[PDB]
Design a protein around this ligand. Structure first.
Ligand SMILES: CCCCCCCCCCCCCCCCCCCCCCCCCC(=O)N[C@@H](CO)[C@H](O)[C@H](O)CCCCCCCCCCCCCC
Ligand SMILES: CC(C)[C@@H](C)/C=C\[C@@H](C)[C@H]1CC[C@H]2C3=CC=C4C[C@@H](O)CC[C@]4(C)[C@H]3CC[C@]12C
Ligand SMILES: *Cc1c(COP(=O)(O)O)cnc(C)c1O
Lengths: 184, 539, 561, 69, 585
């Protein structure tokens, strides 16, 4: 087998649980050369109230329907917010525009926020919002066992667990439905 | 089975004490939801984790450099004051390589043509009415009267230079007309213009190649292609110079491995080469490359600069010489206008989608100003003149063949120099035989390549090699003897050794154009042969 | 002519024949009164006070966020449905017969979905010499900004988008005469690389003149600024060095540093405390994976930033490089001839000795009207770089007419060939910039600058306000340039005004009236108390501004920044 | 020093004054309607959308306003 | 020239000459990787594949993306003359290298246009005899048949065989692959008059420099070509037992249109509007010079309808023929509107009335005496004059048949078959065959030119089909004449989609409120099962020009297109307007 002079090879995982490998000198320089634009807008002016405004608007819109009860309005707005947040933060891996030769082709947006530094104020606010939403929704709207269990499941497994530091830089590769995930 | 429960019980007890007040909250939550343990357990867990996360401290990432938290400020001051930098550029070897600056000829108050007057070494020595054999213009079509009149009219109408980038307002109608003319002349759907030819190849290849792609390149190519490969950031393989068996074997291996890997999305692949090489001056075989790219599903990139205006019956490029169609044979073509057409700039030829993507994703096109109008208009006029008549190409081909036949049929030079060029090339290249070089200077090409690679890898500041400098001095001595004893000017290959990556050795070159007469060329050839024999004779 | 609208081709336009006086008035207007000139004074070595920025109310930013979210959602939905169901229309984005496509759809998302909808506002063909009146080609956009159809009709418009600060873009003058004489004597062809053949006395004369003008010891002249920046850095840098650069540098500098291979670190724009902390940490830490001292440390800076229109704190940088034993490199292309009491550049406005900086860069295309670039430094550095560089030995050389144009413009500004022309142009451009900035601030808008920078950015925030404004300016025969999210932060969008030295005062009055009307219609004026020296909100009538601004812009107390 | 080759476009105020359409009885209503329409139109992202989507967005906004009224 | 055998395979298609010598014969390969045509040796023919026989190969055509081969599968015999055999193409096919793939809508539209043209066409050809010429041109050239000596004017498949010609510049082996065809009619029938065998033939050819579809192409262009130009010949052969010589006769006639500038703009009405252009002197002079050089003298017969609608062109044509003042050009006028129930004795009255101007001699024809071996021993008389008919703004066919029948009596007299002073019209079946031949020729030319057929006399009543024909033609003229002209232009080579400047012409581009009128009319009609419907009908018929289906590939002279837009320079729609050069009479 011939060995290339210069190699930049994307390698896939070979196990169910894996951790994305660290970076090299060239990749570190390419990442540090230019300030990222996907993760910069989080800290700008007016980027924290917008979540509260979105939640209030969604609640008011879902309350407008005639036949919907209060419990289902709260459940629908919780569904919408959690699904939107998950799809925006934890599903798409990469950069919409062209960065320095695909240097960020293995990290999501949450791992890109604040240059991978942990326990920053933005992360604190973003992890604090869903818990307050869940608590207010449960307290103001009387639920049943079935709806309460489902809401707890949704909030726990869709909003909080991906934010935990233990799951940072983690990939799950099911040999069935899920395809093999790039590891380097 | 039991360690998990024990650790779960142990964990929250510590953070209960860590929080300034935790027992009151737990008691209140337990009392409020005393009926059901599920709700109070969920609330306690969520609130406690939120609070404990809020109260932590920032933690950076683990980088290559190691932290040093055990240093006192006095030590910090000591290390900061102890640091010693290096000079910006080392001046130790400046005087040794200075002669190559003092040997550069300077034209005085005349256009560059066949007969010029030069001065060297800061007006210390002056030679008049010399015969020029170092120019790089082959057709000399830009010195005629009609092109001069067109240039004067364009300058009177439009001005000297443009004042904007192509993005906002720097693009005019003459540029569009030139693009249309090039696309029609060379038989391709689209073309794109670039301000400088040296910055064309490094700017287009990185646009279409990303990490995880495969590129197969020739054994020896010019420096701009090497820079493009370096900026490409993709896997790069090398195959032997003009050896199709090795190329076929390499493609077979790559295809088999890729098929066995079972990859979801197929990557992008390329084959990078050129026409008449800049350093060797030989021709590349097109039909075999076309057959291989059609068989193994590869694309083709050709960086032809010395073959646009010299090859073919009319001068349409490398494709015309082999009697093929450019639209399907070659995928990406890179050209230049300074060599044969007689004006500055460069161009890239291909289909419509590639041009549409280059107009947005190419750095050298988006972030630079447009070309002046007169160069564009003169190039278009030259293209029309070339389309009308084709006597210049025939004359150039005959002169080049006659020049090559003279230096490759003699017997008195067989033991000293060898010719590595091609009969169709307009430039003739001469090198020293390995036996004579080994006998005289005591080194070979492989040792020089190994030494330079070792120095480049070790990142040593001073890169100075003695035998290479001696050989360059010897070739300069030959050139100076030829210029002093006879009124003939020839040049050697000017390269920078510390920037090259592929093997290379010093050589000598002779140029030609279509405005000469056979008698002068024959006399110049005889004089050059006599000077070479007189200077290089043993003992 | 019965074929439908499906023919797209830019038509070559014949020139218009006019008397000499009308053409000269078209290209360069004459002075109204001797009182419309201002003379700029030196700072005598004082650091720049911290800049003051202004903000709009919250609801504008909230609406911006909502608009961007809606647009992104719609784009993704359209892309998904189209790619999933209608395969035939999108054949250019699919794998055909075992070959991968040229590009992927994810990377080209913003170009296809957001920018394309406004694609008619960016690229506009023109004709004729670009002066204070520029002729534009009439066109109609078919489909939705997909292709255009031209009817071959032209009209003039006042231009505010051309890089000619001192107005040397002329067709009847001494520079054009010199260029024509050069074409008569020298041809338009170049021999080849400057190392083997292609060096004449003109190149040497130009190098000596540039070296004398800038104030350094020796200089070199190239044929392209972008190539100069790209190929300069690898000549004296390696893997053991460090480059600390601003975060708002040009693309060419980043390309050069990427090609060199050195380690890269960046610091926040306008922060000196962060720069000092970064330097102190980097010196101590050392090289990666081995922890050895760095070989050398270089700092890269820009004289004036075009988008922001703010200067760089030079005395502090000189102090830091002198204290910590670092090297400094300065790129100045927007302030080489348009700034300073005489026009030398940043080193003159701050009173800093030119010997303190190590390498100075610049291009001739911004102000002198000719393409090119130069590098200025000491003697031994240039002696080493003349041999170590790759552009000198492998690339082409610069033609004769451009060189003659550059030499003539430099001699005109230096005050040799023409007696009293350079000072008049410098004073004209200074006064024009001050007048426009003060009038726009008094009307109620928001602008950035340093009170003399030729570039004036006016801020628009909502995504839907940037197209219409531009189109309206085309209806009033004014040309403008706007920038958007991929280049500037998400919240802030802006339109750039590039004032020239050929415009007069009455043109500025006409511009002010039309801009005030359009901004009033579109609800664009939103100021505060931080954009005034008194500290109170101001919303002035147009007549009062036009009547009292010209006599008050010459004072230095009315400018907050 | 008083001739050029440009054509000047007069502002809308001077055009209205020349046409003699400064009577207030209908101009007040016209100005109110135009100002309300532009205030509604500019702040929403209608210039970047397509006709098919803009129709549905208009219908949705009209329905919300009418129902809340 | 003979049957071909082709083999389809994953690497392309190979064509070989089925009947030959078995020596080294060229094999034509259509490449699959780059879509090219190449010539190879005999050994490269695939072995394991299946061979398919085809009667003849027409050519290759290059569309926007791929390249296609047009093939004629089977043929049918029509007439046999002097041993030669005439054939008619029955089945057609289009072959592409790719087995299956994705193609854009434009490619599908182009394929549909090609299929539409191939469906409504009738081609004729012969392996040995050359039909693109007449007996004069055949006699002036050697007795061999080749594409080099063919007439470029009736060489219908010219643009399709270009590649097959490029290799054949110096390549005799390729000569056997090129096959000229004609777009017209050809038939021959045999009979016995008085114990002597005779064969009567008829051939009709059509030019290629103009197009058809009636209203779209009329008058002349700058180059002098005339729309609807066709040629007719009525060859005859006779054998006499009482002697040895074999007799061959020939007669020629030409048809065209008035050479003045004029046009008929179509709208939503039964009768369109007539417009006349500017002065025409150069084009008419060049056209008449070409006609004089080719055929010799000319005799212009101008039949016209009633004055009311077709008057203006008559005065212009008389004025131009007077202004030319050419001794070799002679004008004879005739006018009938009084014919009743297809009674045509005034045709004989006119024939008596004719012959007085310049004396059409019955001697003026082509006479040939040929032996049993067919060596063309000796010629007798040659033809030097023709009659040019430009009528019907039916009639031309009736005039031509009568003139040919009148000449045929002298033709029989010169062959010593029947004694002088005897009429040959006595036999019923012979004249029945004659009439059945000319009626079929008339039907063929009428269906080829404009829509359905025309009024037919046959032997020896039919107002129902006659009326239905008018309604069908009225519908076809106003709603289904775009694609026909587009197919003509695409096949003949007028439009070549090989440039990036030209965008797709198929999508509709007229404004929306013009498009919505028919839907509103249909909705009102189906909810009516009245003021809205009346208003919509009035609006539709008040702007007919905007609703007529127009050709798109190649422009027409008498129209202009305006592009409307809003204040922000954005496209809204296009409108059709009458060209300013043409004017109302
Ligand atoms: C019936 C039962 C319930 C059904 C529940 C499902 C309903 C529909 C679910 C919708 C899921 C998808 C919606 C979220 C998609 C978000 C965007 C997709 C693409 C992500 C990558 C884009 C890259 C651009 C980078 C960038 O800087 N973008 C930024 C600007 O350009 C970014 O776009 C802006 O800041 C937007 C500011 C948003 C502020 C907070 C939003 C969080 C709440 C989301 C709830 C969704 C509600 C839907 C109505
Ligand atoms: C009750 C449920 C819903 C959830 C939210 C409760 C607690 C979670 C967050 C707890 C359960 C176990 C915890 C845990 C176990 C072990 C360790 C290792 C230690 O070195 C760092 C903290 C860390 C990583 C923590 C983090 C927080 C975890 C993951
Ligand atoms: C405008 C700009 C350039 C342009 O360089 P050219 O080679 O003249 O096109 C270079 N550098 C900077 C900083 C610029 O702003």
């Amino acid at each position: 087998t011939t060995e290339p002079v210069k190699d930049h090879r994307r390698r896939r995982a070979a196990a169910i649980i894996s951790h994305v490998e660290p970076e090299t000198f060239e990749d570190e320089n390419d990442q540090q050369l230019l300030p990222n634009m996907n993760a910069t807008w989080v800290d700008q002016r007016g980027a924290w109230i917008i979540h509260v405004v979105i939640i209030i608007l969604l609640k008011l819109f879902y309350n407008l329907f005639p036949g919907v009860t209060t419990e289902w309005s709260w459940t629908l707005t919780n569904m919408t917010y959690v699904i939107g947040s998950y799809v925006m933060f934890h599903l798409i891996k990469g950069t919409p525009f062209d960065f320095n030769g695909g240097a960020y082709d293995n990290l999501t947006m949450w791992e890109q926020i604040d240059d991978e530094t942990l326990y920053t104020p933005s992360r604190k606010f973003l992890i604090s919002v869903p818990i307050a939403l869940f608590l207010v929704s449960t307290h103001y709207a009387h639920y049943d066992l079935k709806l309460f269990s489902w809401n707890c499941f949704l909030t726990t497994f869709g909003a909080v667990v991906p934010k935990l530091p233990v799951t940072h830089r983690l990939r799950i590769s099911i040999p069935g439905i899920t395809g093999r995930a790039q590891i380097s | 089975i039991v360690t998990t429960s024990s650790y779960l019980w142990y964990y929250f007890n510590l953070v209960l004490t860590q929080i300034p007040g935790g027992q009151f909250i737990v008691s209140y939550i337990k009392k409020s939801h005393h009926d059901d343990p599920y709700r109070t357990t969920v609330e306690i867990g969520l609130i406690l984790y939120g609070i404990i996360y809020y109260l932590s401290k920032p933690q950076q990432k683990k980088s290559l450099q190691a932290q040093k938290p055990n240093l006192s400020p006095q030590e910090i001051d000591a290390l900061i004051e102890d640091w010693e930098p290096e000079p910006l550029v080392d001046p130790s070897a400046t005087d040794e390589q200075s002669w190559r600056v003092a040997k550069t000829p300077v034209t005085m108050e005349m256009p560059i043509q066949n007969h010029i007057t030069i001065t060297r070494n800061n007006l210390q020595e002056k030679y008049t009415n010399v015969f020029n054999l170092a120019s790089n213009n082959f057709l000399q079509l830009s010195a005629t009267e009609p092109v001069k009149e067109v240039v004067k009219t364009t300058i009177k109408n439009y001005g000297v230079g443009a004042c904007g980038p192509a993005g906002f307002y720097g693009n005019q109608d003459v540029h569009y007309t030139l693009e249309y003319d090039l696309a029609q002349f060379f038989g391709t759907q689209g073309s794109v213009l670039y301000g400088q030819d040296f910055c064309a190849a490094p700017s287009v290849l990185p646009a279409f190649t990303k990490r995880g792609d495969v590129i197969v390149a020739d054994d020896q190519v010019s420096l701009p292609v090497q820079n493009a490969l370096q900026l490409s950031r993709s896997t790069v393989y090398y195959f032997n110079h003009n050896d199709m068996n090795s190329l076929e074997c390499l493609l077979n291996e790559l295809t088999e491995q890729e098929k066995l890997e079972k990859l979801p999305a197929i990557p992008r692949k390329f084959i990078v080469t050129e026409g008449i090489f800049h350093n060797s001056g030989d021709l590349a075989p097109l039909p075999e490359l076309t057959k291989l790219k059609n068989k193994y599903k590869f694309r083709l990139f050709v960086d032809e600069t010395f073959s646009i205006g010299v090859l073919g019956a009319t001068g349409r490029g490398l494709s015309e010489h082999f009697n093929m169609d450019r639209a399907t044979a070659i995928d990406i073509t890179v050209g230049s206008m300074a060599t044969a057409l007689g004006s500055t700039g460069g161009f890239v030829l291909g289909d419509s989608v590639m041009c549409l993507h280059q107009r947005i994703g190419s750095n050298a096109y988006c972030f630079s100003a447009c070309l002046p109008a007169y160069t564009v208009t003169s190039v278009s006029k030259v293209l029309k003149l070339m389309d009308s008549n084709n006597d210049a190409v025939q004359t150039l081909q005959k002169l080049s063949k006659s020049l090559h036949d003279s230096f490759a049929s003699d017997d008195s030079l067989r033991s000293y120099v060898i010719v590595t060029s091609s009969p169709v090339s307009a430039v003739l290249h001469l090198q020293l035989t390995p036996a004579y070089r080994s006998r005289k200077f005591g080194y070979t090409c492989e040792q020089l390549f190994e030494t330079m690679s070792a120095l480049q890898k070790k990142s040593q500041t001073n890169k100075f090699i003695e035998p290479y400098e001696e050989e360059e001095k010897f070739l300069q001595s030959i050139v100076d003897h030829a210029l002093i004893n006879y009124n003939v000017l020839i040049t050697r290959n000017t390269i920078v050794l510390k920037q090259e990556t592929l093997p290379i050795v010093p050589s000598l070159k002779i140029c030609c154009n279509a405005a000469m007469s056979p008698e002068e060329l024959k006399n110049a050839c005889e004089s050059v042969k006599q000077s070479i024999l007189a200077c290089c004779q043993e003992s | 002519m019965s074929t439908p609208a499906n023919y797209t081709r830019v038509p070559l336009c014949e020139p218009e024949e006019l008397p000499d006086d009308i053409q000269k008035e078209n290209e360069y207007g004459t002075l109204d009164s001797p009182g419309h000139l201002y003379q700029v004074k030196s700072r005598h070595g004082k650091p720049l006070p911290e800049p003051v920025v202004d903000t709009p109310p919250y609801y504008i930013s909230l609406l911006t966020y909502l608009n961007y979210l809606i647009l992104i959602i719609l784009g993704h939905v359209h892309d998904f449905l189209g790619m999933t169901f209608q395969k035939n229309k999108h054949l250019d984005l699919l794998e055909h017969d075992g070959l991968a496509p040229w590009f992927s759809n994810f990377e080209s998302f913003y170009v296809r979905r957001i920018k394309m909808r406004i694609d008619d506002c960016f690229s506009r063909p023109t004709t004729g010499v670009p002066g204070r009146f520029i002729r534009c080609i009439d066109r109609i956009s078919h489909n939705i900004n997909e292709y255009f159809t031209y009817s071959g009709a032209v009209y003039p418009c006042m231009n505010l988008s051309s890089y000619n600060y001192l107005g040397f873009a002329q067709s009847k003058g001494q520079c054009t005469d010199a260029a024509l004489e050069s074409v008569d004597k020298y041809s338009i062809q170049s021999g080849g690389p400057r190392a083997q053949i292609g060096t004449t006395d003109l190149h040497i004369k130009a190098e000596k003149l540039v070296a004398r003008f800038i104030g350094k010891e020796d200089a070199l002249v190239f044929s392209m600024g972008y190539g100069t920046n790209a190929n300069l850095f690898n000549a004296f840098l390696d893997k053991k060095c460090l480059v600390i650069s601003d975060e708002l540098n040009h693309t060419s500098i980043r390309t050069g540093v990427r090609l060199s291979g050195a380690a890269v670190r960046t610091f926040k724009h306008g922060d000196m405390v962060g720069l000092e902390k970064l330097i102190r940490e980097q010196i101590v830490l050392g090289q990666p994976k081995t922890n050895r001292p760095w070989k050398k440390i270089l700092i890269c800076a820009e004289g004036l930033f075009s988008m922001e229109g703010t200067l760089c704190n030079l005395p502090k940088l000189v102090e830091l490089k002198k204290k910590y034993k670092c090297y400094l490199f300065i790129d100045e292309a927007h302030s080489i001839g348009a700034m300073g009491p005489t026009g030398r550049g940043v080193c003159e406005i701050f009173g800093v000795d030119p010997k303190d900086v190590d390498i100075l860069m610049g291009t001739f295309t911004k102000s002198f009207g000719a393409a090119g670039g130069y590098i200025a430094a000491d003697q031994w550095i240039i002696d080493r770089l003349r041999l170590d560089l790759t552009t000198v030995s492998y690339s082409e050389s610069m033609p004769a007419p451009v060189l003659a144009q550059t030499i003539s413009s430099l001699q005109t500004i230096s005050g040799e060939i023409c007696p009293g022309q350079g000072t008049e142009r410098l004073q004209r451009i200074a006064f024009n910039s001050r007048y426009l900035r003060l009038a726009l601030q008094r009307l109620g808008f928001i602008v950035y600058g340093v009170a003399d920078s030729p570039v004036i950015p006016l801020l628009l925030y909502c995504p839907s306000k940037m197209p219409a404004f531009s189109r309206m300016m085309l209806q009033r025969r004014i040309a403008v340039v706007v920038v958007a999210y991929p280049a500037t932060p998400l919240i802030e969008s802006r339109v750039r005004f590039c004032m020239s030295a050929s415009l007069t005062k009455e043109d500025i009055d006409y511009l002010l009236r039309h801009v005030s009307e359009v901004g009033d219609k579109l609800n664009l004026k939103s100021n505060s108390g931080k954009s005034s020296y008194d500290g109170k909100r101001q919303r002035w009538d147009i007549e009062e501004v036009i009547r009292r601004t010209p006599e008050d812009c010459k004072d230095d107390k009315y400018f907050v920044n | 020093q008083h001739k050029s080759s440009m054509v000047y476009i007069p502002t809308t105020k001077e055009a209205k004054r020349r046409n003699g359409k400064s009577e207030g009885i209908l101009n007040t209503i016209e100005e109110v309607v135009e100002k309300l329409y532009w205030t509604y139109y500019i702040h929403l992202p209608f210039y970047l959308m397509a006709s098919f989507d803009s129709f549905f967005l208009h219908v949705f906004f009209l329905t919300i306003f009418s129902l809340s009224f | 020239t003979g049957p071909i055998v082709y083999v389809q395979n994953a690497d392309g298609i190979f064509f070989k000459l089925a009947e030959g010598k078995g020596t080294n014969d060229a094999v034509i390969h259509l490449a699959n990787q780059d879509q090219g045509v190449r010539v190879l040796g005999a050994e490269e023919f695939p072995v394991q594949g299946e061979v398919v026989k085809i009667a003849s190969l027409m050519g290759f055509i290059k569309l926007k993306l791929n390249r296609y081969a047009i093939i004629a599968n089977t043929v049918e015999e029509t007439g046999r003359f002097n041993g030669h055999v005439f054939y008619r193409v029955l089945q057609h096919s289009i072959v592409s290298t790719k087995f299956n793939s994705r193609i854009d809508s434009e490619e599908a539209e182009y394929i549909k246009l090609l299929e539409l043209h191939l469906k409504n066409s009738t081609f004729y050809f012969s392996y040995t005899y050359d039909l693109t010429n007449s007996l004069q041109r055949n006699e002036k050239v050697g007795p061999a048949a080749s594409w080099k000596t063919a007439d470029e004017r009736f060489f219908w498949n010219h643009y399709l065989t270009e590649d097959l010609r490029n290799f054949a510049h110096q390549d005799p082996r390729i000569d056997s692959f090129i096959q000229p065809v004609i777009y017209g009619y050809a038939k021959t029938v045999d009979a016995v008059l008085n114990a002597t065998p005779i064969v009567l033939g008829l051939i009709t050819r059509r030019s290629i420099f103009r197009a058809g579809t009636r209203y779209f192409r009329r008058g002349v262009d700058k180059d002098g070509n005339v729309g609807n130009f066709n040629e007719t010949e009525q060859i005859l052969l006779a054998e006499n037992p009482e002697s040895e010589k074999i007799h061959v006769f020939s007669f020629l006639q030409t048809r065209g249109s008035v050479p003045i500038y004029w046009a008929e703009i179509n709208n939503l009405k039964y009768k369109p509007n007539l417009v006349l252009g500017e002065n025409s002197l150069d084009a008419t002079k060049k056209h008449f010079d070409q006609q004089k050089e080719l055929y010799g003298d000319n005799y212009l017969v101008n039949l016209v309808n009633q004055k009311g609608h077709e008057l203006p062109v008559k005065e212009g044509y008389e004025s131009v023929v007077h202004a030319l003042n050419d001794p070799k050009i002679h004008y004879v006028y005739f006018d009938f509107h009084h014919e009743c129930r297809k009674m045509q004795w005034h045709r004989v009255k006119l024939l008596i009335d004719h012959l007085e101007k310049l004396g059409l001699s019955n001697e003026d024809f082509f006479h040939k005496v040929i032996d049993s071996n067919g060596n063309t021993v000796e010629i007798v008389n040659e033809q030097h004059s023709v009659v040019r008919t430009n009528c019907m703004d039916d009639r031309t066919n009736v005039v031509q048949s009568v003139l040919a029948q009148w000449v045929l009596q002298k033709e029989f007299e010169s062959a010593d078959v029947v004694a002088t002073g005897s009429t040959w019209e006595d036999n019923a079946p012979l004249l029945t065959s004659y009439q059945n031949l000319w009626a079929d020729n008339a039907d063929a030319v009428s269906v080829a030119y404009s829509g359905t057929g025309a009024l037919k006399t046959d032997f020896t009543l039919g107002a129902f089909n006659d009326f239905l024909n008018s309604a069908s033609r009225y519908y076809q003229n106003n709603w289904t004449d775009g694609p026909r002209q587009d197919s003509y232009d695409l096949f003949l080579g007028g439009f070549r989609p090989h440039t990036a400047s030209i965008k797709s012409p198929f999508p509709d581009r007229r404004p929306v409120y013009i498009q919505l009128i028919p839907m509103i009319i249909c909705a009102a009609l189906t909810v009516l099962g009245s003021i809205v419907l009346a208003l919509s009908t009035k609006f539709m018929f008040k702007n007919g020009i905007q609703f007529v289906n127009w050709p798109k590939l190649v422009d027409v002279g008498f129209l202009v297109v305006h592009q409307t837009h809003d204040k922000e320079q954005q496209f809204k729609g296009l409108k059709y307007a009458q060209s300013p050069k043409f004017s109302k009479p």
